[PDB]
Chains A and B, each alone.
Chain A
Amino acid sequence: VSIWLIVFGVVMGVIVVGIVILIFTGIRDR
């Protein structure tokens, strides 16, 4: 599996989802 790639995978997922949930709350503050 190359076990460091799945941890990285899961972390990146959350990071991106978060940035998205962050740039759309900022459009619901206009």
Chain B
Amino acid sequence: VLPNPGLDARIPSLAELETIEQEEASSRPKWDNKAQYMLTCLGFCVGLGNVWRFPYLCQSHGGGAFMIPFLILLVLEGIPLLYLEFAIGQRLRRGSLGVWSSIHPALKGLGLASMLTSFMVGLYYNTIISWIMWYLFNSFQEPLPWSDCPLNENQTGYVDECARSSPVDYFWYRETLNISTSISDSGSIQWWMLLCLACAWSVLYMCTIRGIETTGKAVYITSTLPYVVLTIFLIRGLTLKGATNGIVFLFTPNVTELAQPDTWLDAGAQVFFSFSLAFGGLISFSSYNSVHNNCEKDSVIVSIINGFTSVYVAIVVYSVIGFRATQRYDDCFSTNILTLINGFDLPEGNVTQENFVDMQQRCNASDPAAYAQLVFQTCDINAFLSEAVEGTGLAFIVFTEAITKMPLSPLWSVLFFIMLFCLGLSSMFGNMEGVVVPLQDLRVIPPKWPKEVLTGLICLGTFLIGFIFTLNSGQYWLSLLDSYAGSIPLLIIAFCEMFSVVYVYGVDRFNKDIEFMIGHKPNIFWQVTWRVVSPLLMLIIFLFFFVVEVSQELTYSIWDPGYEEFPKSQKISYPNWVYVVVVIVAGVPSLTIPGYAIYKLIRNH
């Protein structure tokens, strides 16, 4: 609809497409099976955000109902977008930067914004896998290292911050991270973490070495395994003590939370991360298929499994939170029992849980001034089920504490950390496909130097930039970039893909070309959401961002062991030079989409 000239003789033509696949068998890779393509697309949508990000948002935002919100927004943003992304790579036969430079070559910023976004997400997601395989190496020993406090020098008492905090909370901040008190104070490289980082990048270079003919078998294993383990964790989780008391708590509807501008944003920004939209990897994976492959049936099957898995991991996660909260309620209520037995001389099995409150008043009516020194607790469930931990603590200080109280402790910890590893790995494959393929269409290296050499300089180049998160303050740097980065770029890049296919390429040329592949020109549901609904629905997510950014009082959490009233929380209000980092990681992937479009329109004219 927008007047771009010369669209033909820049893209392949429709009558020429039946001859192009019997010559792109050379000089272009190809899938072996159809299941090799669906398993590497499920692994790119499902990873590490269904574990510690979705089940918190499913409950904290009026769970049981948030399902509703998350659903609608899905079959509205997600479906339409994913479909249009699968059908644009199969037709134009290029990667991510080659598709948007084929249609109006003055655009070209959507390819460079997808490469900068895939570089920054895959930079810090390879440090989370670095932390995960550190907890995997510290398995294979029956007293796990996060099970008991160490002794200090004289072997008479514990270490001081292991006694005020928890031993698990001590293994993360002092024996894994060696964290500092601020983001300003940084130290050395912390060798162990560095070795682990090396291992992670090395394991990543072995799987994605020769492009797509290695990540095939890789995807197979790294895509099934995760599922089987997740299952095994369901029939163990639903048996322990306190599951079905953490499943009910997840699915309690609170309809007041639906009328909130902050609910529909993170429900909207999870859909763009429950899938892998606006990343540039799903277009490069779809471009290897046959020309008559059904891409309408693939986008429904991929989105049904992604909507079913996000509920399925939340059942497994909140079964373990329900077991940990029932255990902490019983090891609290047995100490309120133990106080009066040690003060009023009663038999052992005397004064259980059924008779606590009536035996409170039998003692104070027997003899006063002996109840006044008694310290009791006000501990109760829905206060042990209601901690707001999120993002890394749901696996390193919450899930791994409930594993130590199970029967076979060093076996449920090996099975738990190899699964997370697998998830991370599949996501990594995705992001790597995202940064290598646009770096070949730019031709930064000569057409010598085969596929082993370009991937080796990406895995070694992103390794040296990953030294930031190995410092003492390296966990404050990783909690900074994540959110911001992701969110902003994702939304913005996602809007201009829906715009430049419908109004620059033309939705009438699109329909014809699609029909040429499958038959049966798409329904009234596809024509409505492509044209009016999903571009409008992606603007109110972009409008709600600058509503919740201007009033949330941007802060961050520190540890600070030498601090009065220590183990509660802390928020100490980021320094003024950190806005340089926020502008850099969130702004310049957003600004290369207009920035190249202004440069190309003034170089010619």
Contact = CB atoms under 8 A, between A and B. Distances in A.
Interface of A: 3-5, 7-8, 11-12, 15-16, 18-19, 22-23, 26
A3 B140 contact: yes
B209 interface: yes
A18 B206 contact: yes
A15 B199 contact: yes
Contact of A8 (B137, B205, B210): B137
Nearest to A30: B450
Contacts of B139: 7
Nearest to A29: B210
A12 B202 contact: yes
Contacts of B195: 8
Nearest to B145: A4
A23 B450 CA distance: 11
Given A15-B206, A23-B452, A26-B452, A7 B199 contact: no
Interface of B: 134, 136-141, 195-196, 199, 202-203, 205-206, 209-210, 214, 450, 452
29 contacts: A3-B138, A3-B140, A3-B141, A4-B134, A4-B138, A7-B137, A7-B139, A7-B140, A8-B137, A8-B196, A8-B199, A11-B137, A11-B199, A12-B199, A15-B199, A15-B203, A15-B206, A18-B206, A19-B202, A19-B205, A19-B209, A22-B206, A22-B209, A22-B214, A23-B209, A23-B452, A26-B209, A26-B450, A26-B452
Contacts of B210: 22, 26
Contacts of B203: 15
B137 A4 contact: yes
Given A22-B206, A26-B450, 20 more contacts: A3-B140, A4-B137, A4-B138, A7-B137, A8-B196, A11-B137, A11-B199, A12-B202, A15-B199, A15-B202, A15-B203, A15-B206, A16-B202, A18-B206, A19-B202, A19-B206, A19-B209, A22-B210, A22-B214, A26-B452
Contacts of A18: 206
Contacts of B202: 12, 15-16, 19
Contacts of A22: 206, 209-210, 214
Contacts of B140: 3, 7
A1 B32 CA distance: 45
A23 B451 CA distance: 10
Query: Which 10 A-B pairs give the minimum distances between C-beta atoms?
Result: A4-B137, A7-B137, A4-B138, A15-B202, A19-B206, A8-B137, A18-B206, A22-B209, A3-B141, A15-B203
Contacts of B452: 23, 26
B457 to A, nearest CB: 14
Nearest to B139: A7
Contacts of B209: 19, 22-23, 26
A28 B92 CA distance: 33
A27 to B, nearest CB: 9
Contacts of A8: 137, 195-196, 199
A14 to B, nearest CB: 9
A21 B289 CA distance: 29
A18 B206 CA distance: 7
A9 B485 CA distance: 35
Contacts of B206: 15, 18-19, 22
A29 to B, nearest CB: 9
A5 B195 CA distance: 10
Contacts of A12: 199, 202
Contacts of B138: 3-4
Nearest to A25: B210
B210 to A, nearest CB: 6
